[PDB]
Ligand binder design. Structure first.
Ligand SMILES: NC(=O)c1ccc[n+]([C@@H]2O[C@H](COP(=O)([O-])OP(=O)(O)OC[C@H]3O[C@@H](n4cnc5c(N)ncnc54)[C@H](O)[C@@H]3O)[C@@H](O)[C@H]2O)c1
Ligand SMILES: NC(=O)c1ccc[n+]([C@@H]2O[C@H](COP(=O)([O-])OP(=O)(O)OC[C@H]3O[C@@H](n4cnc5c(N)ncnc54)[C@H](O)[C@@H]3O)[C@@H](O)[C@H]2O)c1
Lengths: 283, 283
């Protein structure tokens, strides 16, 4: 008769907690899973943080609505119990092939037949994981963006093996929790958004490193030329220069030249971007 | 005592006429140069078109101000006479190495010593031209965008040989005619704007060709993810699919795959973008 009602999220970190909370906020029955009681205690702290954020930032969260969502969440550190009646499992464990491999094999065994599996992985492709799951027709990617309550896209990307009626029901779940479903047709590293954004940021980095123009110039050129609200380097500051450095340092020669540039001129000086109050720009 | 007053523009085509007119509109003494009286007649028609546009679209152009600028422009099809008292020459002849080569050698000989030379070339690098000029310390690029009155950037890009006091005076001329100077430090193919934009559009094209996602999806992902007003394919429509095809067809394998895609699905059907009323989107 009915579809997705019970959702279990694996991991209560930065994205796990946001995913779980947004889902609870939209009336699903949520279980947050993590490794031990200390991780669960820390999860609860995040959920209380999110609740506060929602009551100030999110439509409909005022006057106790965010607290009620908070209070309704269940915590579990026993995977078997955590997914026992799960309609959907959203996996946001650390970005580690080994650690996700471990997770899915167990999850494939412990979760009832009905359960749809969805990974939030940034870099690990579903195909890289579909094996360990044991239910490829029910395994796909549901990829969120940090600050899901306002950057509310959910990229839906399955494998060739993925069942279309499952894919569609994930899409509809995404709408149910207030996301804009971004539907990919074939698997793709970086889904859509990162696929578009990285090339822009790389081109900007090259201009800076090769001494063609300063950040301000590059940024105003982009805002004026495309009408965008923020230029590449303003975007770097939002992404965070530590993240930008990590990514830059594992790519072609030119990017690595940028990573070294970030390290010397920003990272080493403690100018990590927006969150810390100064990166390419002072805030 | 005084600086740039007399400006001669070589070519009265799409960008030559806009450059000349904006410059006349801001009080410089402008001579428009073209090859014969028939080209000059057509120049006059464009200038009258621009005058109409300015009176409806441009601050300060109403109540005869745009007509007065129009009336003050001089036409010449004799290069010697055209640049005889020129402080600045802006070159917007066809994008043709041979045709610009011809131009600069003559111009180097005919223009008084004081004259600064500036090319509006998109693809031809200044260094590719500095030779034929004979005044490398007074030769640089001043690159405009189509619809200069509203897309009012002017990318200033010189050669290693370029004289810094000349570069700065071009920058100040750019401000004088209401442009936002985009100052490049070293030469770069595509200056700043195209350098940033092409990679974004290419990444979008790849997603479309490889069947990862449809235009709408890719566009909404970009607008939502970056807050930009327009997605890649809306931008393609603005650029014009004929232009996009030309550029796509002379680049790496993946782009060529896109060019063929444009040709089959849009060009061959007469869907050329915004100007004709339909491209990726119907307008
Ligand atoms: N952080 C982002 O901006 C972002 C964006 C999109 C997708 N993602 C993806 O989400 C996942 C990373 O999550 P995050 O960085 O947002 O939070 P995080 O990495 O800070 O937290 C990881 C969560 O998993 C828990 N955990 C640790 N070991 C575990 C295990 N052995 N089994 C089950 N849980 C375990 C941690 O305690 C924590 O609750 C990766 O797939 C990453 O690619 C992150
Ligand atoms: N069109 C754009 O969007 C755009 C943008 C930036 C830069 N540019 C650059 O401007 C130049 C092209 O100008 P356009 O396409 O805007 O106008 P156009 O090419 O339509 O017109 C060319 C002008 O040069 C004239 N001309 C032809 N032969 C000539 C010659 N032998 N000697 C002198 N003049 C001659 C033509 O009659 C016309 O007046 C190129 O350098 C191009 O890269 C164009």
């Amino acid at each position: 008769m009915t579809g997705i009602t019970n959702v279990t999220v694996l991991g209560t970190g930065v994205l796990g907690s946001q995913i779980a909370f947004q889902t609870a906020f939209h009336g699903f029955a949520v279980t947050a899973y993590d490794i031990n009681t200390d991780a669960l205690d820390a999860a609860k702290k995040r959920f209380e943080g999110l609740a506060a954020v929602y009551e100030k930032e999110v439509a409909g969260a005022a006057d106790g609505a965010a607290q009620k969502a908070l209070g309704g969440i269940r915590y579990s550190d026993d995977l078997a119990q955590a997914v026992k009646d799960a309609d959907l499992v959203i996996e946001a464990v650390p970005e580690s092939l080994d650690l996700k491999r471990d997770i899915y094999t167990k999850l494939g065994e412990l979760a009832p037949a009905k359960t749809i599996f969805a990974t939030n992985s940034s870099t690990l492709l579903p195909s890289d994981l579909v094996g360990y799951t044991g239910r490829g027709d029910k395994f796909l990617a549901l990829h969120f963006a940090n600050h899901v309550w306002v950057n509310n896209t959910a990229e839906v990307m399955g494998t060739t093996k993925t069942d279309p009626e499952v894919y569609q029901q994930v899409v509809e779940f995404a709408s149910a929790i207030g996301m804009v479903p971004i539907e990919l047709k074939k698997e793709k590293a970086g889904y859509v958004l990162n696929s578009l954004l990285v090339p822009l940021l790389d081109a900007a980095a090259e201009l800076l490193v090769d001494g063609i123009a300063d950040p301000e110039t590059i940024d105003k050129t982009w805002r004026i030329g495309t009408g965008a609200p923020k230029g590449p380097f303003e975007i770097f500051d939002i992404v965070g220069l530590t993240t930008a450095y990590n990514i830059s340092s594992v790519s072609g020669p030119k990017q690595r030249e940028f990573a070294a540039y970030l390290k010397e001129n920003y990272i080493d000086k403690g100018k990590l971007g927006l969150a810390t109050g100064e990166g390419f720009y002072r805030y």
